[PDB]
Model the fold of this input.
Amino acid sequence: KELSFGARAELPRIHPVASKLLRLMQKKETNLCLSADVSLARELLQLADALGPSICMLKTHVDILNDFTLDVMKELITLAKCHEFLIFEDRKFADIGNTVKKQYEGGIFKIASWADLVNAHVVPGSGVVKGLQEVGLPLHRGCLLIAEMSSTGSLATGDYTRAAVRMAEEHSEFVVGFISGSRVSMKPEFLHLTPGVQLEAGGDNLGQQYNSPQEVIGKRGSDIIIVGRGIISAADRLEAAEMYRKAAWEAYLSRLG
Amino acid sequence: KELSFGARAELPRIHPVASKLLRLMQKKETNLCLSADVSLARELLQLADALGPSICMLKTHVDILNDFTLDVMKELITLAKCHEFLIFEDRKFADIGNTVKKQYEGGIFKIASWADLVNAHVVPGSGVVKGLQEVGLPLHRGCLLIAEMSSTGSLATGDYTRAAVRMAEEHSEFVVGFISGSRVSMKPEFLHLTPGVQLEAGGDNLGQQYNSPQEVIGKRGSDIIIVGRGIISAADRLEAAEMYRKAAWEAYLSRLG
Ligand SMILES: O=c1[nH]c(=O)c2[nH+]cn([C@@H]3O[C@H](COP(=O)(O)O)[C@@H](O)[C@H]3O)c2[nH]1
Ligand SMILES: O=c1[nH]c(=O)c2[nH+]cn([C@@H]3O[C@H](COP(=O)(O)O)[C@@H](O)[C@H]3O)c2[nH]1
Done:
């Protein structure tokens, strides 16, 4: 039987990052993650500020920020704290453990220094998790494993997906959940986040397919919707965010009973 | 009867980037790609200068450079042209097409502006290739697809690998070859680059495993060895590079017969 976000936050095996997330979701009645896919620091921060009350999480691609500095991230963390949301860097770590450790801690981005959550592809095998965890465990960070993809011709199906779940379950000290299209694990300590979400049917010219918040949360058993263009491209980003929040939240409430 | 690199450079369906690469490999008697896994620009540039004559390609992880600027890349391009090697940014693009085009063209790194070659995981479906090529084709760049990985528990096996090969064949205007452990394509227009290479047997504690140049080039039929710590960790990186070059080159010569 399904526990609320609030109750899942208190589970014995729950990761502290997952717990923080689950509490603010329950408190704010939001299971929406904004995908802030913009190329300017100014717009990133304006959206984070205006939409922060509507969201549980702000997902970034800092490698697309034309004017990235660590100070932009400082400002982002202030908004995260003020409005209460987690920052998820959608880096999709996908190298060998020795390499991803450096990409996570170092370079220009210093992702580990500001990102509550990052994600990884599982294709390299568990060394990818092991490398990230050397940096992320001391910094009290969490990781999401890419179990399925939204895009057309995704190879993250069947046994690949089962491998992702196995890897998460065996690295629960650092791995807090999945990027997936549906519920992939039966353990309620794990989060499921689902991109490829819009209110209306369709896709884009480059392989992306869409499903509705009611489908993903209500029918497919996911926890959080990740929404980019469905919000960012809208004229009124605030009413768009509210629309997605209310959709995903009501879908969750009806699944719960 | 196997074609030399020089003959392959003239193949009717050869990609211009592959052709340029194959011709300098022939000219300089090198099928060594230096994996320049360093965090300081000065060491990067000193290695590229000293080892440039011994290598056909210099592979970078720009996201690990503590003092990255576009000017560092300018200086690297100069050395690349002076010594005749290609620059390969090992970015492992792995998002949906819409995102990867932004990550390739834009952000701080502007990878497409200086990288002859980049690579991609095939997990997202062919959208990842379609995305990169929107940027890459107009800039006369090439892409390598990751068909296999060297690390323990790699899921790039069986149908996953066969999928990578199909995806390359179907996007030959942009895809010039593979990262793999062995020959995966019968078509000689495609390059095979193989990481996880050292003169001695062994591995690291984050899932990396090693095979020799002789095994990789001679027995498994790959074209180019990618060598990081085998060279970088040596006192004399120039003599180390020469050892790897001679090993890989002679293995290639003995395969041709
Ligand atoms: O880890 C992932 N697995 C997926 O299946 C997937 N599909 C889309 N994306 C990323 O999510 C965002 C989607 O943005 P749109 O709502 O604008 O399509 C963008 O930021 C994309 O990069 C994915 N990430
Ligand atoms: O695309 C890839 N598929 C692979 O299977 C693989 N194995 C290692 N690497 C990368 O290659 C370099 C190898 O470094 P070492 O020689 O120091 O182990 C390092 O830069 C690693 O990031 C891989 N890249």
